[PDB]
Amino acid sequence: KTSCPIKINQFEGHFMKLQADSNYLLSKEYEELKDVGRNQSCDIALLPENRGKNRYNNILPYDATRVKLSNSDYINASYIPGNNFRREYIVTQGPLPGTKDDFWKMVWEQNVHNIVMVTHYWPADQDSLYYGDLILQMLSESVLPEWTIREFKICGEEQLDAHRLIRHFHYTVWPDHGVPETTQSLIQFVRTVRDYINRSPGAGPTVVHCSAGVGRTGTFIALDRILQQLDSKDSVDIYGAVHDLRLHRVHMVQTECQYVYLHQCVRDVLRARKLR
Known part of the structure; x- marks a missing residue:
């Protein structure tokens, strides 16, 4: 299975069902995702010439979905699908001192x-x-209070544009261990970023990173996709969103706790909506 759609009017009980027995059935579901994407190689990221370019040598882009720099072409970054597109996100690691120029080159070249x-x-x-x-x-x-917004002007070698305003959204309240203490916090951050994405004349792909571009990055992206689903359709597919992300980069939603949190977010949104 690549998809587990739930009608919204059934979600609350389905999630209670998933949670019963200390998460018996949630756990079984989460485990079915374990191997998704894992058939793919990261040969280019493993080249000797690229070793210094990875923050963590065990957290590498798949060859099949990696982002290339103009002609090496290597950066630790992966293209991801969203609700809307083709190349809707780029997930990357926190740049190293020696890869920050590469990071900004990617941001420029990819129209971010x-x-x-x-x-x-x-x-x-x-x-x-x-x-x-x-x-x-x-x-x-x-x-x-819970994030910092920066605006930058950037100019690189002209192609589709010659100068550009970039917004940078830094969520500053993710606990060092575990998930955010409220669903509301990440929901509101995601809705805010999505609003800023949507209202631009042309946003290009959105870059998302934590230290490595992993569990928290995947959770942000999945929640972005899932909240757009809830605004558009009468079913929600958390399983499908996570599956799709995992196809494109390793560790996209990396813990069972993150998988639960995504379910709690959807639960909470639907509770509030039923009432208004």
Whole structure:
């Protein structure tokens, strides 16, 4: 199975059913996802020439879905599908000192207008700096209670554009161990970022990273996809969203706790909506 759709009017009991017996059936479901994507190789990421370019040598992009830099072409980054597209996200690691120019080159070349950090490779103040062949300038930094929003102006080698405004959304309240303490917190962060994505004339793919581009990154993305499903359709498919993500990068939703949390988010949204 690649999909487990649940009619919304049934979700609450289906999730209670999944939870019964200390998560007996949830666990069985989560386990069916274990091997998804794992048939794929990461040969390019393992090349000797690329070793210094990986933050964690065991967390590597699949060859099949990796993002390429213009001509090496290697960056630790993977393309992901969303609700809407083709190449809707790029998941990447936190850049290393020696890969920050590569990070910004990717952001420029891939037409990225929004970056999501759920875990510094940008300027500390408003004075401009080069990163390789690109120039970057921070225009604003807004510290809010649970995330910080920065705006940057970037210019690289002209193709589709010659200068660009980029927004960077840093979620600053993810506990060091486990999931966020409220569903509301991540739901509101996701809705906010999605609003910023949607209202642009053309956002390109959205870059998402934590330290490695893994469990938390996958949870952000899945929740983004799942909340869009809830706004559009009368069924929700958490299993399918997670399956799809895993096809494209290793560790996309990496723990059972994260899988539960996604279910709790959907549960909570549907409870509130039934009432209004």
